[PDB]
Symmetry: D3
Subunit: 154 residues, 6 copies
């Protein structure tokens, strides 16, 4: 709907280890989405447990958290029209076995537990994840020189 | 059967030109095996754009669509190859980028349907009409690709 | 999609070699996380190609298919990884490029089904047969990728 | 050095035949130069003889004219600060064997007689070549949305 | 010439507002990633003028000082720290000559930039100025400690 | 000086670090895009005796045993490329042997840092290419074919 919608995109430790930061950022940049926050971070366990709160009563929660502590994460906020849903489509199916070539996971990933990246699955979950991973001051307000060539309206 | 000398009209719209997508879009068609037979950077007159979009003349956003298509240069192209009309449309991706797939031009580069960076003919007969509208017949260059027999098994 | 040591046979056909697509095709499998365990440029004899296409021996186009595959070099490969047979075919795209999706090898590079740039084994059992036909066993190279544990969940 | 300097860049028939139109355009696009005219053409022999009139006594002249007639040419006018000199640097040394990897000829070409592209060698020669290859109404006046991010001033 | 020999050398690389505006974050990061260098800190930031004036303290006697600061205020900056052998000097070589007119195709500025006042990126010019810039642009806890899985394939020695 | 024979051949190897770091495709593409013709290729883990022969000129050096041990530590993508001046131009494409001295735009200037992890090898002379080609490949593994675009890459035979 509105061009100022925001989503949380994270490059997971395997994506960082495998040297996929540049290519993944380029996918969103090239689409016309606007990077409004980014940091390389190794978040505390409590923050990862909150991010994965929906999985805390599911099997093998401890192992997920330990894996996500095992390397740096490139955390990002991207902004644009339908960026939540379109970002998920750019990432590709969450399990790379089901993803399409031309998406991030369809180009770079094989195992669902090593699926390179995360994207918010809804507008409301995006707002929650952005608040969890970023201080408000870390969200940078700016206007792209090509805004009116990417968008026909606000 | 489909013949390898089918032609389609592909245009890079002003937003495509402004956002520096000329090279990447041409590469998509080149790499697939299609043959560039005509190309020109053009700022066509309003009357030609209104003819191109005559199917939409009675819509209210017509005046604004034509105004946007006048707002910058256009890279007009004719591409030739087997099923190039249909496959060209697939390469561009869904007309509305919201519905397009990553790996297509719009799925890689575009967001808004009104800023969908390119155009492709939607049928062989519409391609013929668009080619006659945007090009003089002498602007179509006859030539044979050195790899024709490696792209095509017949025709 | 079971064991991470599944193997498939991928060949770049004469038209793929002629059109300079060796690099790009290898990069697609490399970038996905699959492991190259065998490779050679080869112009195999007619009898090998007839054996490769043995399941088509009673089709009328058999002789013409064999003759075309003799018309230039072939880059023969074995790739290894989880679900590499089926995912490999997905990466190649639909056998007929007219039905293939942009983002796949054929959806990016090919038009005619008889000039579809590449081949990949269609089943695990056919992959084992094709690997045994195109490579000597000592041509399969045993090695472990430095990023194995970032591509695959332990 | 004004930012409205213009140069003539042509992709020669070998560049067209070998599928290098896209990549060569991207090199100039990516650098920040502005495409102001472009057409695919098969110019008459007279125009090519005028284009290479200074070499009309050189031995490779008539063979050059014949090869320049042997396929389409992608003729272009590019605009920007020091675009004549920097454009030649982007093309690389006239003889590709003396050119640097990272230039067009250093990435794509081998023989000086098959060196993929032409670029004007001086501001005055650019003006002459633009007048020879283009009608003035084929040069398109426009303003790049990122002009103020490519240039500090005009 | 002389090159560094310590694999834990660090440099500060910034993508300037024009590089962010022109969509070059991904390509520039890929250049350093592809070379084998390790990203140890990164953030998108619009720093205050006081920090930019400190960043350019070595140029505070130059006539272009004020304009340089004002320009760096004009949009977001992708600030980064990269780690690896000779990363200060090799990082500058990857960026290319500071003035893009003098830069070579195949470098960042040789591929992407024209005007020195819009030269897309910055790299520390010395080991000591890298130390200063790293500490100026990043809080100490924003430097991330990790070990690249391919370290022993990028480097032959410690 | 540059070679003038279009059937010159050189030996290019992607070293174990090039293979490990996923550079086979990009490296092949550099030579493919330049117009050179691939006439032989195989993934190989050669025996120590062959690597010792390949580095015969360094058998006296103190790092010889370690250099051999490292070249044994992973697979190698061995190739023969054919074209005009392919030996010298091939080395230029690879970049300076020490990546620290190489230029961005070359293979080592894009991908490598340490001279002992410089991702690839190219023959340093026409004669050493002939020797390396014969050392790394059986004669029947060199493939005879004619590129569809030969006459567009080359102005003369
Ligand atoms: N030994 C030589 C030297 C020059 N040439 C010519 O030098 C040209 C270089 O391209 P160009 O004329 O469009 O550009 P410049 O000569 O201004 O660098 C070749 O394409 C040929 O026109 C040749 O064919 N053989």
């Amino acid at each position: 709907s509105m061009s100022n919608e925001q989503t949380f995109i994270a490059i997971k430790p395997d994506g960082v280890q495998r040297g996929l930061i540049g290519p993944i950022i380029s996918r969103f940049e090239n689409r016309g989405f606007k990077l409004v926050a980014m940091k390389l971070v190794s978040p505390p366990q409590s923050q990862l447990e909150q991010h994965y709160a929906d999985l805390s009563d599911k099997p093998f929660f401890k192992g997920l958290v330990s894996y996500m502590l095992s390397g740096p994460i490139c955390a990002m906020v991207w902004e644009g029209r339908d960026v939540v849903k379109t970002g998920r489509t750019i990432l590709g199916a969450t399990n790379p076995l089901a993803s399409a070539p031309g998406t991030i996971r369809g180009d770079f990933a094989i195992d669902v537990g090593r699926n390179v990246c995360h994207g918010s699955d809804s507008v409301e979950n995006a707002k929650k994840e952005i608040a969890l991973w970023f201080k408000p001051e870390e969200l940078i307000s700016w206007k792209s020189a090509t805004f009116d060539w990417v968008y026909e309206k606000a």
